[PDB]
Design a protein around this nucleic acid. Sequence first.
RNA 1: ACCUCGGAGCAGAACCCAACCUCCGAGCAGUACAUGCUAAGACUUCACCAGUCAAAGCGAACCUCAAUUGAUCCAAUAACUUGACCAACGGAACAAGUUACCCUAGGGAUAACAGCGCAAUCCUAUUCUAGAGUCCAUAUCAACAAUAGGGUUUACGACCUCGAUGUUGGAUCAGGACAUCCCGAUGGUGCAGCCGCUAUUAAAGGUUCGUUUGUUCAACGAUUAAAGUCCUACGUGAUCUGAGUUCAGACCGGAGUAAUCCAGGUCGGUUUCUAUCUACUUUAAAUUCCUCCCUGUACGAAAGGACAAGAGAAAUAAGGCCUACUUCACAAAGCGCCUUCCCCCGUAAAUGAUAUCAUCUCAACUUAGAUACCCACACCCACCCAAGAACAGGGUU
RNA 2: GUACCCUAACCGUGCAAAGGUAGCAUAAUCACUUGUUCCUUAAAUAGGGACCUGUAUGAAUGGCUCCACGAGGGUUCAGCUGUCUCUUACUUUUAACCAGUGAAAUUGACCUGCCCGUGAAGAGGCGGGCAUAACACAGCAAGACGAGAAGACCCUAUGGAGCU
RNA 3: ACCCCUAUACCUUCUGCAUAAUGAAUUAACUAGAAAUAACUUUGCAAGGAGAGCCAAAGCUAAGACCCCCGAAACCAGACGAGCUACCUAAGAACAGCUAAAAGAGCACACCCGUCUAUGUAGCAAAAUAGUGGGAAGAUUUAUAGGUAGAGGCGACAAACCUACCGAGCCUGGUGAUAGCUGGUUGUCCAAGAUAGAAUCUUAGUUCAACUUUAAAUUUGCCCACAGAACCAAAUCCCCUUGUAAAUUUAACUGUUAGUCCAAAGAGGAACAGCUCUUUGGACACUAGGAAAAAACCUUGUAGAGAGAGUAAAAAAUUUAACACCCAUAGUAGGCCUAAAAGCAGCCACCAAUUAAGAAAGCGUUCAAGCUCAACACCCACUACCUAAAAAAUCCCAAACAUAUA
Lengths: 111, 50
Amino acid sequence: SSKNLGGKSSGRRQGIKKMEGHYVHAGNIIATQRHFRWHPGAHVGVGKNKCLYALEEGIVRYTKEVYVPHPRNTEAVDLITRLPKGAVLYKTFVHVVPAKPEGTFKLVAML
Amino acid sequence: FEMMRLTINRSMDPKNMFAIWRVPAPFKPITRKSVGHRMGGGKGAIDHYV
RNA sequence: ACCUCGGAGCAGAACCCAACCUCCGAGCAGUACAUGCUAAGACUUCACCAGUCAAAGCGAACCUCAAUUGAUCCAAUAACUUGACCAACGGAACAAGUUACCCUAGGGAUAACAGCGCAAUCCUAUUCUAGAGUCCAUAUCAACAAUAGGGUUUACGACCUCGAUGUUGGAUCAGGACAUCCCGAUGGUGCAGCCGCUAUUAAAGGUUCGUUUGUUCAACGAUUAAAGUCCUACGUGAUCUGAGUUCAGACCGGAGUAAUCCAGGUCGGUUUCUAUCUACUUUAAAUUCCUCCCUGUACGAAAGGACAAGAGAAAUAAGGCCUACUUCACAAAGCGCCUUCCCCCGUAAAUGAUAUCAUCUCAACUUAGAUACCCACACCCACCCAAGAACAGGGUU
RNA sequence: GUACCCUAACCGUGCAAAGGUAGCAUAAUCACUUGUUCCUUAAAUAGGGACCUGUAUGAAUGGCUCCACGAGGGUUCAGCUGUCUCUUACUUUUAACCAGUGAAAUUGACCUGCCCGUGAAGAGGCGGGCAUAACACAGCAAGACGAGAAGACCCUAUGGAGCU
RNA sequence: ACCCCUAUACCUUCUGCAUAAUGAAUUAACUAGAAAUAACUUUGCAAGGAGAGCCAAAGCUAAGACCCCCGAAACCAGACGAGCUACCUAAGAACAGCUAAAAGAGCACACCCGUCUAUGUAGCAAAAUAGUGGGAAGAUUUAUAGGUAGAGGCGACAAACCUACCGAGCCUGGUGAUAGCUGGUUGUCCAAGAUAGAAUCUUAGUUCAACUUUAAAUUUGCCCACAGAACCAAAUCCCCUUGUAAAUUUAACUGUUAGUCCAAAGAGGAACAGCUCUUUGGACACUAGGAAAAAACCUUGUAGAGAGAGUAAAAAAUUUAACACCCAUAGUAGGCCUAAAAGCAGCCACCAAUUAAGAAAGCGUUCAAGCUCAACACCCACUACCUAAAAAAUCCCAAACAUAUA
Ligand SMILES: C[NH+](C)c1cc(NC(=O)CNC(C)(C)C)c(O)c2c1C[C@H]1C[C@H]3[C@H]([NH+](C)C)C(O)=C(C(N)=O)C(=O)[C@@]3(O)C(O)=C1C2=O
Ligand SMILES: [Mg+2]
Ligand SMILES: [Mg+2]
Ligand SMILES: [Mg+2]
Ligand SMILES: [Mg+2]
Ligand SMILES: [Mg+2]
Ligand SMILES: [Mg+2]
Ligand SMILES: [Mg+2]
Ligand SMILES: [Mg+2]
Ligand SMILES: [Mg+2]
Ligand SMILES: [Mg+2]
Ligand SMILES: [Mg+2]
Ligand SMILES: [Mg+2]
Ligand SMILES: [Mg+2]
Ligand SMILES: [Mg+2]
Ligand SMILES: [Mg+2]
Ligand SMILES: [Mg+2]
Ligand SMILES: [Mg+2]
Ligand SMILES: [Mg+2]
Ligand SMILES: [Mg+2]
Ligand SMILES: [Mg+2]
Ligand SMILES: [Mg+2]
Ligand SMILES: [Mg+2]
Ligand SMILES: [Mg+2]
Ligand SMILES: [Mg+2]
Ligand SMILES: [Mg+2]
Ligand SMILES: [Mg+2]
Ligand SMILES: [Mg+2]
Ligand SMILES: [Mg+2]
Ligand SMILES: [Mg+2]
Ligand SMILES: [Mg+2]
Ligand SMILES: [Mg+2]
Ligand SMILES: [Mg+2]
Ligand SMILES: [Mg+2]
Ligand SMILES: [Mg+2]
Ligand SMILES: [Mg+2]
Ligand SMILES: [Mg+2]
Ligand SMILES: [Mg+2]
Ligand SMILES: [Mg+2]
Ligand SMILES: [Mg+2]
Ligand SMILES: [Mg+2]
Ligand SMILES: [Mg+2]
Ligand SMILES: [Mg+2]
Ligand SMILES: [Mg+2]
Ligand SMILES: [Mg+2]
C-alpha cells in the first residue's frame, strides 16, 4: 500500500549566508529565503526570488525597524488599515554599512 | 471509561453526590495493522481512540 | 505498489538528515514582445552535469507563478531555431514469456525445517466485586478492568548454519516438568449415602486394543482405576519405515496463443556409511483391580447404599527356574511355574503467652508424625565345564 | 418476478456466432468434501448402489455401455500362514580367537570428562562447581552441528542453456 | 618432568568467529604485481635541450620508482565416432513338451525382458545376486556385414537413444574464453590511518565527492566575548579575546563507500524483538583492568627491562496482616402505596419518652418475628506496625559467615 507519493525533494540550502560583522563585497548574496523573513534595508538589494544581496561593500548589520508598506501593496495596506490604533509593525532588516569612501581627489598635473 | 462510569454511577448516591470528568473523550487515534502482516507496506488503519 | 519535480511534518532555533513514513500537489496557464545586448560579485540541493540572483555599462522606457521539466549523439532547416509519458524521467537507437529437463558462480549478506529473540496471538494465576447461582459476589461460574507469570500455537525478526544442521506421521527406546488423568493424604460444598463439583499436597507406580484416514488430529466400536498436558533439533532415519510431502513419467478440471502452470486431485518413483573420540553397556524395599464378609450395616422418607479392619483371588512389572505342559530334547525357551518387604506432610487437635479470656505456635512446646547380597586366593602344563567373543572364572581325589 | 419452503411449466428484459444437446454424474476432477441416502464392518475420511446447474462434466480435446485381456490403481468372501499377539529353537554364512596376505573414505593439532551458566544466540576446550591412577578387548549409536557430494529447495548474477 | 598460577589454535570471511562458518594429515620441492600519462628524487646542459623527427614564457635530456594466481556453465570452426544403443538394408539362425490342432491363442523349457521383495551400496557388479515374475510361432529373439552424425541422425514422444554424467556426442583449436562471484597471494622493522553523500539495468560493482596518505608553498586553523539569525526544548550558527598548533592552498594517488551495540530526540511495529529507519554523542572493529564467562557498559590509552610504589573502575539489599467488652425498653404495624409490605420493596418527613437508642447502618424474614451496630452506664483503652504471591521441562549451584576500632 502506502498511497503517499512525492515528498522526496531535497533541502533548499537557504538561510543566512552572511551574519553580523562579516565583511561583504558588492553583489555578495547575504540571505536566501522562500518568504520575506529578512527585509532589505540600506544598500541591500532584493532579487526576484526574494534573495538579499549587497549593493555596496561593507559590514552587514541586522536591525529591527518599523514597517510601512507601499500604498499600492493592497494586502499589506489592508492589514495596516485594519490594525488597531497605537500599534506599529516591526520587521527585521539587513543593512550594509559602507566601509570605503566613494573616491579621493588627488593631484595629477601642475599646469 | 465504561468501568469508571458504571462503578461510580452504581456506588454514588445521586441525591447528595455529584461527579464530573476531568478527562476528555477518547480522541488520540491508535492504528493497528492486519494480523500476521510483515513489516512495511505503509501505516495501518485507525483502530481505536484513547 | 512505486520510479521524475515541488510544499508541510518527522527535522521546534544556521544548513543538512531516512523509511513500501504521515498529508498535499506538479508534467501548466496568463501577461509581454527591449521576455534586447553585455558585465563586477556571489549562491548552489551535499560530487559533476544542471540550476539561481545580480551592481555598473550600451540600447530602450519615463513579468506573475511553487513544481510546471529531459543530456549527448543524431535528424529537420538557407539561417535562426525545433525535435521523446527517452515517465525505468542522468535517458542502451531498436529485444517478451517459460523451464519440475535444467546448468554454473556464489549467499546463512536471503527465504523454507530446526535453534534463538519477542510475546501481538495462545495459556495460567491473582486483584476488584458488576452479574448468574430461590435469597446469597466469593459451593460453583463470572463482565468491564488491573497486576504477574509461562514459552506448547500462529506469526513477527533475519542472529548461527546454503564447501548440506536430511522432513511429516509410525516403529524402537525413552529422559524430564507438574499446570495430576488414575492410585495416596487433606480443606470447602447448594457434601444425608452412592456419585459429584472445587481447592491444597503428592511425579515413587501406572496411563488399552481396534475400524476409516499417510496423518498429527478427528469420528466410531469395545473396555479400563485412568486411557493426562507438555518439553526433549515439532526427542530419537551413522537404529528402522517412506504412506504423505515439493525432482525427472502421466491423467482429469481450470489458466495460457503456446512452451508451460495451479499455495488442486490422482497412479508411479534408488533412504549410502567398515565407529577414530566422548558417553554408556547387571544401581535386592512393586503397584493396581476384583470377590467375600463387615452389610443390606452406617446414612436415607423410600429408592438406593458406604468408609475402616480382615480374608482370598488375579493382572501387570521386576527377578529367576525347567517338575509337568508346550516349541523341543545331555540343553535352550514360554504359552508354564516360583518369589516380590519402608514411609512420605496437605492438615487435624491439647496446653499456653505477646494481648492475665481466647489462640494448633514463622512463641517457647505436646500428638497424629532398614536389612539383604558380595567378602579366602601365584595347583595350573594340560583336560573338562551348567563359565565364557578373547581374557577371566569353576572342577581335575 | 410467478404454483406455502425448494423449484419454476410461465412472463418480462439485455447480449452473442451459438448459448452445453444426448449421455453420464461427488469422477483418476478447483474449494465446499469426511455432499445426502442404502449395503458391507462390532466400529468405514475405504469400497459398491442411488440423488445431484458437474455455480469449472460432456460427445473423434471423443461421450456412454459392454466381451475378453492387464507384474496397472482400489475393495472383498474363504482358506493360508511367525505378518502380528509374542517370540522361541536349530543349521549355514557372518562373527570372535590363532596363522598368512593386506585396502578405503577420514585426519589443524590434541595430554579428547559431567552439570548449570555464558557466548556468532545448541561448549570436551570460556565462568562457577563436580569428577578424575594408567592401558587394552568386545558391544552400542545419544553427541562430535559425525563422513560423503564448493545444497537437488530459495535468492542473487547487467552468468548460461533448452523450449514457445 | 608433572602437580600451583595465567591462557577461548591458525587462515579467510564478517557488524561480530573458540566457534559446532571456510581450508588444511604431515614432509620435501614447485606455485601468484607485468606498464603508461603525468608527477616526485638525482644528474647533465641551459633560453635552449636532445646522436635529425620532439618539446620549450626554465625548459629539455637520462635514470630511478606503480599496476597478481587458480576456477565455470557456455559460444564458434574443423575433425572423429551407429563394434553400445535408436531405426533401416542384404543374406542367415533358434523356438522342447502339453491343451487345440485356426490364433500378434493358453500352460510351459531353452531364450528375451525386468514386476515385487531381500541382500549389495569403494559392491562380484561405474546397476549385480537370490527368489518371485511378463513374454516365449511372433509387431518374437538373435549371430554377420553395411547405412543414417551433431545447426544433425533416429524415435510404437520417454524431449528417449546416438561408445558407462546427451534439453543436445566427443576430440582438437580459437583459449591463458569470460566471471562486478568464491578461493589464494610468500623476508624483517617502524610510522600515519575508520567510515556526510549523489548518480548508476544500480544497491554483491563502479565514478565523483567525503575521509584517509605522502611531498611542497603559505598564513592563520581549532576553543570562542558582547552584540545578532521570523512571522506563522536540549542546542546550533556567527565570533574578538584567551588556551594552544594547526589550518588552507598546490602536486600525486590508492583504499574505505554490504556496520554493530549503548545513552539521548524521534519515526514504523505491539509505547515487541539481539526488529527497521534517521539525527546527536560514545565505544567497537587496537591495548589493558573490572561487571562470572563477555564487542558495543565502566576504568584507562603511546608502547621496553624491574623479584618497587600510589591508585582508577571494582562485592546488592530486603521478611510483610491479633483487635475491643457490655448493653438495648418504647410514642408506632410514623403516613402514602400495596394483600401486607411493620427500621429495613418504593416515596415524604425525620420529630419524640425514659438516664440512654437512627422514624434505623448492616443482616434476616411473603410479611412478620428475630440479631448485630451506632446510644446509656462500664472502664485500663482502644493497645491499632496501614502492609501483600507462585509456576517447566539433564542436575541446586562457589564454600561460608550477623559482633575486634575505615
Ligand atoms: C532423493 N530423491 C527423491 C530426489 C529428491 C529431490 N528433491 C529434493 O531434494 C526434495 N527434498 C525435500 C523434500 C525438499 C527435503 C531431487 O531433486 C532429486 C532426487 C533424486 C536424484 C536422483 C539423481 C540420480 N543420481 C544422482 C543418483 C540420477 O542418476 C538421475 C538420473 N535419472 O540419471 C537423476 O535424475 C538425479 O540426478 C536427480 O535428478 C535427482 C534429484 O534431482
Ligand atoms: Mg521533504
Ligand atoms: Mg532527500
Ligand atoms: Mg555545491
Ligand atoms: Mg543596470
Ligand atoms: Mg532507470
Ligand atoms: Mg534514474
Ligand atoms: Mg512432470
Ligand atoms: Mg550449484
Ligand atoms: Mg525460523
Ligand atoms: Mg444476584
Ligand atoms: Mg540488519
Ligand atoms: Mg543451509
Ligand atoms: Mg564442513
Ligand atoms: Mg555433514
Ligand atoms: Mg500440584
Ligand atoms: Mg523431529
Ligand atoms: Mg543421528
Ligand atoms: Mg533432477
Ligand atoms: Mg509399480
Ligand atoms: Mg541407513
Ligand atoms: Mg571427543
Ligand atoms: Mg501386456
Ligand atoms: Mg589376522
Ligand atoms: Mg551450554
Ligand atoms: Mg570401543
Ligand atoms: Mg554452493
Ligand atoms: Mg547489476
Ligand atoms: Mg553473518
Ligand atoms: Mg570470543
Ligand atoms: Mg570441537
Ligand atoms: Mg558448513
Ligand atoms: Mg571450524
Ligand atoms: Mg560459506
Ligand atoms: Mg554471452
Ligand atoms: Mg550396428
Ligand atoms: Mg502366444
Ligand atoms: Mg504365455
Ligand atoms: Mg511426452
Ligand atoms: Mg517432459
Ligand atoms: Mg579468470
Ligand atoms: Mg600507529
Ligand atoms: Mg543503476
Ligand atoms: Mg555487482
Ligand atoms: Mg540492529
